[PDB]
């Protein structure tokens, strides 16, 4: 109450933001140049997009880990806690980071050529049902409409990762200490740098998106468990996806 109700950003809070922007810029490629290295998309054989999207998700996990390692304090947690945090958050951070390529026009992910322009049918062709697709699209539209500053977007991803309430977290207080520093930075940023309106209720709306991501995670996990139970599907995944999501 002090760091949270702070009128203007401290020097420390400014450094936190700068660090997270750098971390995002070194782990998010807006030219999507590496996508050409994945197994090719196959559209139009109902799980035909599973290999390509498994490669996309595996690549995305590597980038999320790269980002997480730069969050102030994250690398100072025990290795087991780092693992737990990343295993639990990876799909949610993927959902958050993907919003940068999401377009409300045709509710697709533009990455950024026609072959790597992904829609609801592509998700369907990875084995997912409307029980996931529908709330996933709702979330993407809801997030896009918040019109976050890049500063808020990177703070939200970091807050998502360093969540002390994940199952299996050992040193919850240490995790909470990092998350609080980040949450305070976000609150102070919105108060002093985000112009009215749209700063109105923005912080609570962002926290609500974190809760929404938990629900999306649960649904994705249930469907993933169903899909990956069949070893001929698991075979089509990548070693990192199996390791991080389980087998």
């Amino acid at each position: 109450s002090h760091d949270s109700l702070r009128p203007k950003l401290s020097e420390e809070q400014q450094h936190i933001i700068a660090i997270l922007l750098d971390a995002h810029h070194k782990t998010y490629d807006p030219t999507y140049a590496d996508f050409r290295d994945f197994r090719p998309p196959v559209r139009m054989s109902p799980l035909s997009m599973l290999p390509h999207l498994a490669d996309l998700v595996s690549y995305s996990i590597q980038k999320v880990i790269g980002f997480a390692k730069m969050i102030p304090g994250f690398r100072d947690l025990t290795s087991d806690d780092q693992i737990v945090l990343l295993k639990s958050s990876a799909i949610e951070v993927i959902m958050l980071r993907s919003n940068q390529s999401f377009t409300m026009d045709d509710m697709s992910w533009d990455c950024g050529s026609q072959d790597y322009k992904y829609d609801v049918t592509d998700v369907s062709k990875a084995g997912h049902t409307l029980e996931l697709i529908e709330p996933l699209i709702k979330f993407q539209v809801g997030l896009k409409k918040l019109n976050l500053h890049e500063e808020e977007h990177v703070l939200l991803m970091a807050i998502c990762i360093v969540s002390p309430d994940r199952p299996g977290v050992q040193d919850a207080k240490l995790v909470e200490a990092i998350q609080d520093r980040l949450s305070n930075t976000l609150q102070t940023y919105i108060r002093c740098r985000h112009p009215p309106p749209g700063s109105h209720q923005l912080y609570a709306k962002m926290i609500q998106k974190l809760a929404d991501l938990r629900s999306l995670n649960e649904e994705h996990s249930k469907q993933y468990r169903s899909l990956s139970f069949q070893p001929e599907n698991s075979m089509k995944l990548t070693p990192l996806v199996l390791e991080v999501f389980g087998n």
Binding site: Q62, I65, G66, K69, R75, S79, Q82, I83, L86, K87, P239, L240, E243, V244
Partner: peptide, 11 residues
């Protein structure tokens, strides 16, 4: 048992 994750975390 998370050698690839652990590798990607190491520096």
């Amino acid at each position: 048992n998370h050698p690839m994750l652990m590798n990607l975390l190491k520096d």
